[PDB]
Design a binder for this molecule. Structure first.
Ligand SMILES: Cc1cccc(N2CCN(C(=O)c3cc(S(=O)(=O)N(C)C)ccc3N3CCCC3)CC2)c1C
Ligand SMILES: *[C@@H]1O[C@H](CO)[C@@H](O[C@@H]2O[C@H](CO)[C@@H](O)[C@H](O)[C@H]2NC(C)=O)[C@H](O)[C@H]1NC(C)=O
Ligand SMILES: CC(C)CCC[C@@H](C)[C@H]1CC[C@H]2[C@@H]3CC=C4C[C@@H](O)CC[C@]4(C)[C@H]3CC[C@]12C
Lengths: 235, 56, 338, 217, 291
């Protein structure tokens, strides 16, 4: 069974250093690109780092550039994130995400989770906005969630690099829709993805108790990867 | 020997029982299919470079 | 009794030949004489797929007209992105003596086989992110020469043991066996409707089989040497086959006889592969003289040549949308033409 | 190109790196097509080689750090072209013959003629192993060679004359002699020097290739 | 004590009579060789690319010598319009000579390495390495000529190949020139050819088809013989003229004969531009089938 287990988080004083590890089991870790994604307490998702299947290219978020280091040990199937000069803004829950990249693949299809807390002691970036923060609805009734991008996510190759994630209460995010139209494996057909160059919609045909949570829209057109604010969905 | 001979005789009998149309009808049908789909064949009529995903 | 059976067989063959002659009233060349020529066709190498370490034996286009799988003698299966030349997958094989490969219409599986007498099914969409063998179909006493998927669960294979077999991939057992060829079966083509399929063997005969019933519907014998390739017409009412006698031939199912012969005096090499264009107007054949010839299927005129390979052209393939042609050769290179 | 396109190109580049890494090995690999018979002692010879050096059957071993691959096609031997051209790139063909069984020599000689005169195997050398030489030297005294071969000239009980006759009959089947060398050895399956002889023959074949590359004639 | 008037006029007549046919023959011979090996490069690259590269290298050096020959014939009997034209013609001529020598030596060493170490050479030999060696040969000859011809400023030569100064003929320059242009190349060539022939003759133990490579043995022997004939007497004359310049041979009628022998041998040394074609290119069956 595919598993990503993260450790190393805990209480850290400001200006200190920490190393987060992630053991990968049940899949070919060497052929997958890896991302670090953190979520501040009671906030949305924020991509922090990425390392490719090998180690040729490494990307950082501007907030962690120069302070964080992402590395991997392929024989040991472990992903590392070395943080230094930690600030209070680093207090979040850090997940690692699988991301394989070939024609027709499904990036961001598996997540983990670990918590880091730091004590008291962007121009060209694509802006993704989810207008509604909470949609109160009843089971069995269709719901639609919208998300807008400042830049057109449609590419000249015909792809629209928009992703949808669902995070249930107390659970890690899971991929729902990848590239704005494709259903992720294991996701019920009641989820559908439609959109335009800049405006996108996620439709749930028949609401169930399992659909309650926060829905996130993320662009993969270019780095840094940016998320929407997240739309809550409660009974 | 005898069993395989009987099997092949039965196979030949099955082959002979079919109904065959004239060669002219088959040729006309092949021409009609080719003519109907001539506009939709990229190889037969080189498509404009804009509609070519393999342009180098 | 044996002499009586032989006499009955000879009489049945004579009666079949007489019926075929009676149904022959006007040749395809005469019928298509008034049609204007296709004209000279000049396709160019749009892409060159490099990376194989030995001769390429087989290739199959995916149904999306963008992905293709190739089989090479270095024991490697490679899936390519034809648009970008990118290598999607590189599948090592347990046996390096591969001779055929297939792509499932859904894109979830690929098929492999060769001198090991086994049709191997590889799963492309696994939760582990790697390609692993999903099924090993055993039961052929000879080498595997061709395989084509009917769906994710059904596949048809041809063998050097003079038989064709329909397999249920889930159980791994031969659902149906097709017997009647007296020589090694070299190639097989599936009808567009999947109900029928046609086979060509080393006994210089082509046999049309019904997948459901499992018996030989028809037999076609016009070639004078081993048939190495066979392909269906786009409407499924005819098929073309290429042989070692430096000749390609087109047969009609309903007419139950040969319709046209595609040969030239300058051509003496055998045909390795045949393929039709989307409309069926063009018949593309691969040869041992390192070149591919484009034939006008209606007029039997050589309308073009694909000459870009330094060795024998072993495999051919036209996309489902008809936009491109892939050619594989013994020089370890795949070329996309347009 | 997009970010996912760049990452896919990276994956293709990594696959290219793996293929290029494997390319070096296959260039140094020596492939030998084994074409013995049931009475030729093929099984015992293969077992001895496996003991000493540690569909289709393949045996991979190493001599002087050179990777060798013996391809055994016993049983699954076809006469069609497509099967034959699969082995058109092997370094050499090892033909195993039971030299003691005078009755079966004619069939072995016809098989050798069919193998070495194939246009497919025009760039491969021939290594001929005449096995069971002890049985041959025990049988030569009892049975006269002239009974099965009237063309034999020499002393019927002379082992050297019989060996020379066998070598000449095998070499004469090769219609075209100025293409690749032919090597013959009188040995037994239990003999432990077979690998050295095979390596010597392969080294001579590679020397012949190098001489052809130099355009010295 | 010395006189070189009749010697000079006889040598002028002989050098005309030898260099005119040598120029004419070598021109078309090397042009044909370049065309044939270029055809091989553009037609049969995988099997004949590495050999054709240095065959073209040798042909180009021979052609450069051929093209420098008419300047040698004319400028040696007519006044030099420019003071430094003689130095340029001499540089082209001798760079061609020694580049051909070193290409021949590299050919023999390549053959010996392929014969003696078939596995290593089969693994390692490639057209790019041969091309790099040819580039190194060109660089070495051309960047050895400049440090030598830079000292030819005090020569004061109104005619070329007549007035060489005691800058290249001093022991500290003459003897290294002889060692690194004749003695070491001849030793390498002799060892390589003899060992190649010995190894090719020793193949009687392995196969009875060793007689198929008798022609290779003859070609290697011919290469050694042609090298010795074309380059031994000229360096003998160089040594003899060195002895004259150093007063080892001072009595008259011996200096004149040594000068005549040096000039005549240098004239006959340039015949190798055609002997090279006959020895290396026409011995190839495919090359003579193309022609
Ligand atoms: C690689 C290379 C490139 C260019 C010149 C040379 N080098 C050095 C310079 N060169 C001479 O002084 C020289 C000239 C002539 S003569 O033809 O012009 N004439 C008769 C006076 C004869 C012999 C010469 N040398 C050979 C021995 C030392 C001196 C010719 C040989 C070399 C070795
Ligand atoms: C060789 O050099 C000598 C000088 O060392 C040349 O002799 C000079 O000739 C010019 C006319 O050509 C006279 O003006 C000078 O007075 C001569 N100098 C001496 C010292 O005699 C001689 O011509 C040169 N020879 C050649 C063949 O170039
Ligand atoms: C034949 C060609 C390609 C090789 C050239 C190298 C040899 C033969 C020549 C070229 C330049 C020569 C040098 C030129 C000048 C000097 C400086 C002097 O104080 C000692 C001798 C010395 C060092 C010479 C030795 C020989 C030399 C090194």
């Amino acid at each position: 069974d595919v598993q990503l287990v993260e450790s190393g988080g805990g209480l850290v004083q400001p200006g200190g250093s920490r190393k987060l590890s992630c053991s990968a089991s049940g899949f070919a870790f060497s052929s997958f690109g890896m991302h670090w994604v953190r979520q501040a307490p009671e906030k949305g998702l924020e991509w922090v780092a990425y390392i490719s299947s090998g180690s040729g290219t490494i990307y950082y978020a501007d907030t962690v550039k120069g302070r964080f280091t992402i590395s991997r040990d392929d024989p040991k199937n472990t992903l590392f994130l070395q943080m230094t000069s930690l600030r209070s803004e680093d207090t979040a829950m850090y997940y690692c995400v699988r991301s394989i990249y070939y024609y027709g693949s499904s990036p961001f299809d598996f997540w983990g989770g670990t918590t880091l807390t730091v004590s008291s002691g962007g121009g060209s970036d694509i802006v993704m906005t989810q207008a509604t923060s909470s949609v109160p609805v009843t089971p069995g009734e269709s719901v639609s969630i919208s998300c807008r991008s400042s830049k057109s996510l449609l590419h000249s190759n015909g792809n629209t690099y928009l992703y949808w994630f669902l995070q249930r209460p107390g659970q890690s995010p899971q991929l729902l829709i990848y590239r704005m139209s494709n259903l992720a494996s294991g996701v019920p057909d009641r989820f559908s993805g439609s959109g335009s160059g800049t405006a996108f919609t996620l439709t749930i045909s028949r609401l169930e108790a399992e659909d309650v949570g926060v829905y996130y829209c993320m662009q993969h057109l270019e780095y840094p990867l940016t998320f929407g604010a997240g739309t809550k969905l409660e009974l | 020997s005898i069993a395989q001979a009987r099997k092949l005789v039965e196979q030949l009998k099955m082959e002979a029982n079919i109904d065959r149309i004239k060669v002219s009808k088959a040729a006309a049908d092949l021409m009609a299919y080719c003519e109907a789909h001539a506009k939709e064949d990229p190889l037969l009529t080189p498509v404009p470079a804009s509609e070519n995903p393999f342009r180098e | 009794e044996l002499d009586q059976l032989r006499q009955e067989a000879e009489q049945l063959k004579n009666q079949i030949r007489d019926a075929r002659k009676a149904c022959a009233d006007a040749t395809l060349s005469q019928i298509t004489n008034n049609i204007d020529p296709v004209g000279r066709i000049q396709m160019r190498t749009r892409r060159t797929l490099r990376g194989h370490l030995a001769k390429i034996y087989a290739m199959h286009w995916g149904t999306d007209s963008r992905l293709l799988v190739s089989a090479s003698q270095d024991g490697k299966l490679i899936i390519w992105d034809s648009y970008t030349t990118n290598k999607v997958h590189a599948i090592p094989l347990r046996s390096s003596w591969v001779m055929t490969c297939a792509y499932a219409p859904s894109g979830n599986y690929v098929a492999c086989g060769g001198l090991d007498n086994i049709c191997s099914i590889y799963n492309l969409k696994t939760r582990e992110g790697n390609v692993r063998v999903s099924r090993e179909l055993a039961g052929h006493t000879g080498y595997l020469s061709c395989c084509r998927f009917l769906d994710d669960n059904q596949i048809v294979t041809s063998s050097g043991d003079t038989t064709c077999a329909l397999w249920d991939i889930e159980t791994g057992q031969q659902t149906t066996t097709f017997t009647g060829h007296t020589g090694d079966v070299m190639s097989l083509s599936l009808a567009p409707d999947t109900r029928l399929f046609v086979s060509g063997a080393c006994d210089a005969s082509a046999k049309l089989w019904d997948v459901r019933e499992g018996m030989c519907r028809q037999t076609f014998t016009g070639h004078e040497s081993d048939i190495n390739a066979i392909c269906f017409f786009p409407n499924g009412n005819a098929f073309a086959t290429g042989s070692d006698d430096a000749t390609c031939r087109l047969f009609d199912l309903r007419a139950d006889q040969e319709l046209m012969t595609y040969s030239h005096d300058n051509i003496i090499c055998g045909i390795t592969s045949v393929s039709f264009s989307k409309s069926g107007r063009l018949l593309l054949a691969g040869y041992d003289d390192f070149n591919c010839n484009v034939w006008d299927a209606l007029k039997a005129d050589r309308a073009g040549v694909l000459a870009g390979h330094d060795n024998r052209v072993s495999c051919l393939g036209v996309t489902d949308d008809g936009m491109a042609v892939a050619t594989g050769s013994w020089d370890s290179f795949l070329k996309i033409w347009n | 190109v997009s970010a996912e396109d760049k990452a896919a190109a990276e994956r293709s580049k990594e696959i290219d790196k793996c293929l290029s890494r494997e390319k070096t090995y296959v260039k140094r690999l020596v492939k030998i097509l084994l074409l013995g018979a049931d009475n030729s002692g093929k099984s015992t010879f293969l077992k001895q080689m496996r003991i000493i050096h540690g569909g289709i059957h393949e045996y991979d071993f190493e001599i002087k750090n050179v990777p060798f691959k013996m391809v055994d096609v016993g049983g699954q031997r076809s006469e069609r072209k497509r099967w034959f051209e699969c082995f058109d790139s092997v370094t050499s063909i090892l033909f195993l013959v039971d030299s003691s069984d005078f009755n079966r020599l004619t069939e072995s000689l016809n098989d050798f003629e069919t193998i070495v005169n194939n246009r497919v195997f025009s760039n491969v050398s021939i290594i001929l192993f005449l096995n069971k030489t002890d049985l041959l030297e025990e049988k030569v005294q009892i049975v006269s060679i002239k009974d099965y071969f009237l063309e034999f000239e020499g002393d019927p009980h002379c082992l050297r004359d019989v060996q020379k006759f066998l070598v000449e009959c095998f070499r004469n089947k090769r219609r075209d002699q100025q293409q690749k060398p032919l090597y013959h050895h009188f040995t037994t399956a239990i003999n432990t020097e077979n690998a050295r002889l095979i390596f010597r023959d392969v080294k001579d074949t590679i020397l012949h290739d190098n001489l052809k590359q130099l355009m010295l004639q | 004590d010395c006189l070189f008037d009749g010697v000079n006029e006889l040598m002028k007549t002989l050098q005309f009579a030898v260099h005119i046919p040598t120029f004419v023959l070598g021109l078309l011979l090397n042009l044909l060789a370049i065309h044939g090996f270029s055809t091989f490069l553009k037609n049969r690259w995988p099997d004949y690319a590495a050999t054709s590269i240095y065959m073209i290298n040798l042909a180009v050096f021979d052609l450069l010598l051929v093209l420098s020959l008419p300047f040698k014939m004319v400028l040696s009997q007519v006044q030099s319009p420019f003071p430094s034209l003689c130095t340029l013609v001499e540089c082209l001529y001798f760079v061609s000579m020694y580049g051909s020598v070193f290409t021949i030596c590299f050919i023999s060493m390549d053959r010996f390495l392929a014969i003696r170490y078939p596995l290593l050479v089969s693994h390692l030999r490639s057209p790019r390495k041969i091309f790099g060696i040819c580039c190194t040969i060109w660089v070495l000859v051309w960047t050895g000529s400049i440090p030598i011809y830079s000292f030819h400023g005090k020569v004061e030569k109104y005619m070329c190949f007549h007035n060489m100064s005691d800058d290249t003929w001093s022991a500290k320059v003459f003897f290294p020139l002889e060692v690194f242009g004749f003695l070491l190349p001849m030793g390498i060539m002799g060892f390589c050819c003899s060992r190649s022939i010995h190894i090719l003759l020793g193949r009687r133990d392995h196969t009875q088809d060793w007689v198929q490579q008798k022609a290779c043995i003859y070609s290697i022997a011919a290469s050694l013989a042609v090298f010795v004939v074309s380059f031994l007497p000229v360096h003998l004359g160089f040594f003899l003229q060195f002895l004259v310049r150093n007063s080892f041979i001072v009595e008259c009628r011996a200096k004149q004969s040594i000068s005549f022998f040096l000039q005549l041998s240098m004239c006959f040394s340039n015949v190798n531009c055609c002997l090279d074609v006959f020895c290396y290119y026409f011995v190839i069956k495919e090359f003579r089938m193309n022609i």
